Design a binder for these strands. Structure first.
Lengths: 84, 56
RNA sequence: GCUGACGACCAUAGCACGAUGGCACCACCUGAUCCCUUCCCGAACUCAGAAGUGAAACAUCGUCGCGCCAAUGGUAGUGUGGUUUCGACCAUGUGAGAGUAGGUCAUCGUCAGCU
RNA sequence: CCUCCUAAAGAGUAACGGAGGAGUACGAAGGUGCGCUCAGAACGGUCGGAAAUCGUUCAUAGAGUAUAAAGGCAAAAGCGCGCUUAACUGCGAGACCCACAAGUCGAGCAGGUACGAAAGUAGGUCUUAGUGAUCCGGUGGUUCUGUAUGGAAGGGCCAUCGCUCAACGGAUAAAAGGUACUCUGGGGAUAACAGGCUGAUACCGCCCAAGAGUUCAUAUCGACGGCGGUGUUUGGCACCUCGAUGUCGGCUCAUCUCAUCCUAGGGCUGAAGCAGGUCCUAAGGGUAUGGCUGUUCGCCAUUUAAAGAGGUACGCGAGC
RNA sequence: AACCGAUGCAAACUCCGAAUACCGAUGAGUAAUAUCCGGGAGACACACGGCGGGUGCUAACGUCCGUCGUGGAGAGGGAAACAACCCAGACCGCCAGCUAAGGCCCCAAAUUCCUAGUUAAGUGGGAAACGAGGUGGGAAGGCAUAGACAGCUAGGAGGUUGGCUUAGAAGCAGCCAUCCUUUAAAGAAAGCGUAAUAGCUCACUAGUCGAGUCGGCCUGCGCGGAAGAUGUAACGGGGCUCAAACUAGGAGCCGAAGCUGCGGAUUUGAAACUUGUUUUCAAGUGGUAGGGGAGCGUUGUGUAAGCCUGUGAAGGU
RNA sequence: UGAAAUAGAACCUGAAACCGUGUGCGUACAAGCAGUAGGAGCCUCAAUUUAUUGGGGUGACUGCGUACCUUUUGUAUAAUGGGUCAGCGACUUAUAUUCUGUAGCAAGGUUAACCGUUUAGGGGAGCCGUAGGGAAACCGAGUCUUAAUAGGGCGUCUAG
């Protein structure tokens, strides 16, 4: 192993996937209880008709059509369920 | 109105959607000519496989 | 015409600088008995009020100094088919970011009050 | 098991790929109501400074968030105070994820509360790690069963306890080695020889020219660097052969290459001559014997015009 | 150190930010669809060529992912020969035709085809940095009958051996200026030379001759760099030079098991004398593991106390 | 002698591998899985008014063409196995169970051991189906969980 410069560097572990992201995209029909976004933190915020879980999960409080918009003074990404 | 479409090259080794664009027009083999309505929906099938087909 | 409340929108709306406003409204303001306040403090909160003042704040107006927004064109990338010396190139369809010309001192809704 | 990247803008995605954490903590660090805003910099001020505490001006987080990282966080999820136990019970429409077993989110309903004046909020904590099936055994409850009958024992149901079962889907409650004395079934799925691919490394050549050469880069040599050729060293891979391709060296017998050791022909020379040094051409021939060591090699002795470098299964054991 | 201004870079940086891909909606046309339930499996050694990466050396016919195509399990034509590359998916038969990739001088089917050029290296038909006055073309330039480039003749000088440094540094080891004078011109010198001088050139000027010339840039195709082992041996071969090479066009033709033509079989579905009762039509018919369907033959039993058989059974050939 | 004697005692039949003899054709200038598609010549039979076809044998010459099996990502492979021939040689049987087809009966179907003068006839013990829920008691088109009549789980509204 001339120059002898190699050697073990133990960093060969990782965690399992979490399957996060948008589950139902804009303009889709949705029923109450359907999960819309699984996320870490509030990447998207719960608008009218959308609830927020302890996991930060966004779900439909009532049936309708899911809609995405950037609203508010913070330019936050909101998800709403419009009664349509 | 309609249009005449003819397959010049084989569609046997193409992408899955290019294969299904040939089958969406009614083309089954090389040098097979079909008549099909000239609408933007059917012309977009021709667009997807323009290297394969020829519109008379 | 202006003021206040609550909204839409979330910088072309902000920042900065200057000017205007006290009849209403607002704000400072007086006082601390009372309700209520302070790990101390009537500072904030709360009350009782009207001597003073638009100084601050606030609102409105003005501007390009900043910030923000922003083309046209070109370039980069790229789906598909082909070619390649593997860098890329051709056909077709897309097409940025940066930068430039330029724009900007917002725009509306409901209600109430003075005029 | 968790976080980031690899991961190719949905999910997922491997490597003995690059980086880090976990096997906890907390009856408040949970719930609610109310209230608050940080890190820094500068100025002024007793000890007291660079920085303790105080006052002032800027100050969308340059701080904090119990714990790594990512994503979040002003209605603060950050920081205090009062009262508290929702860190409830029975559930749960509907979804995410998923081979299964599992895991995740969840409005709403009923009962009993906690805080709030109330609308309300609360089924633990900003989230994602903090974990382990079944069997068996224990404990708290229960009318379910109760081997003739009444009991009881035992069992069932509900709740809970006992795992570095950490090789973490856990083979048993219970477990190390040696074999050159070995053996069987297989594999060129997988190593050692040789071939193949590759050429990092090696060897050889070229480019540049700092310099050495008393002067003078280029007679000769070529620092720092650059570009190739060969298969030729040390390697990388595992493509061929494990129902067998014999290992090194010697002997015998070779065959080829040229990057030429001698002899032959040349240019330059720091070539006076004699001898050389480089480079070009050239493969026709030739190119030792010994001491040591199994050696190839290497050192040494004595020669020779010279004692070449290599390929040939590191040529050649159905030739020794 | 910072702070300002120019200026780069980053998988675990992002003020930004596609194309695709993915999740939905609506709508035509085309399509042997999608989904669910059950019987039977096989497979869980993959490989190469692209594309995006990690690893390795942007090494490997390496390795590990993602994604596509092909092979696996796929014949045919082309790539000389060549599972994985290109064209193309073999039901069977034909001494019919058109084409794809690739090709058309001969081996060997089809152009010694046409037009305009390039190459002189057999480049084509291996190989780089780098070198060169090969050759063609294109944008510009400088100079020129007020005699241009080259040659030849003459001069190329004086302060001064510039100062310093140095043994020596005298144009010419090296460091700091680039000055002035006779000038038509002559550098405080671009080389050779000397220990230093000396010496020979050059730049530059005048003369002679007389017409175009000089040097950079870009583009195409060439040249050198270029040395290996059984034998040419790095176009498959022959051979090829106004090509039989290359570039840009054009027209023919050859060329496959592709397509069409003719005949025949077969699977599935479709209108009916309706179970193959008949005539057709449409789409199909490569195939390993494997799943499904339909049959052939052999020995024996009943049919069979039959039928056949010495006018010759079985078996053999 | 015998019907037969290539039925003659190694005796029925007498295959193949393998070995001879005879006839016809080809073969001593040409490179390879030995064939295949063409194809001249020669030889031999049957017709035919006489070389014209047809059948048979041979195969000069041309094109194409690297056995089979196994195992593999991939084999002409210089990977395995086989010298050849003949004969033999590997998915069975018993029971249970599930699905499919078919037949009989059909809200029913069917008997087993046995007896029997025995494939009949008898034998209904048993099994499957027709009801599920719940650990179970228990209830039943409902039932379980629950304080709940709410919610939810599992069932329901025939063919065996």
């Amino acid at each position: 192993a001339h120059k002898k410069a190699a050697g073990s560097s133990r960093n060969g572990r990782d965690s399992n996937p979490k399957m996060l992201g948008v589950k139902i995209f804009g303009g889709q029909a949705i029923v109450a209880g359907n999960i819309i976004v699984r996320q870490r933190g509030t990447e998207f915020h719960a608008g009218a008709g959308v609830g927020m879980g302890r996991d930060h999960t966004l779900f439909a409080l009532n049936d309708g059509v899911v809609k995405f918009a950037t609203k508010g003074k913070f330019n936050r990404r909101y998800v709403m369920v419009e009664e349509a | 109105k309609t249009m005449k479409v003819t397959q010049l090259k084989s569609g046997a080794h193409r992408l899955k959607s290019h294969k299904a664009s040939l089958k969406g027009l009614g083309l089954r083999r090389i040098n097979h000519s079909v008549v099909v309505e000239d609408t933007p929906s059917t012309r977009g099938m021709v667009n997807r496989v323009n290297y394969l087909v020829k519109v008379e």
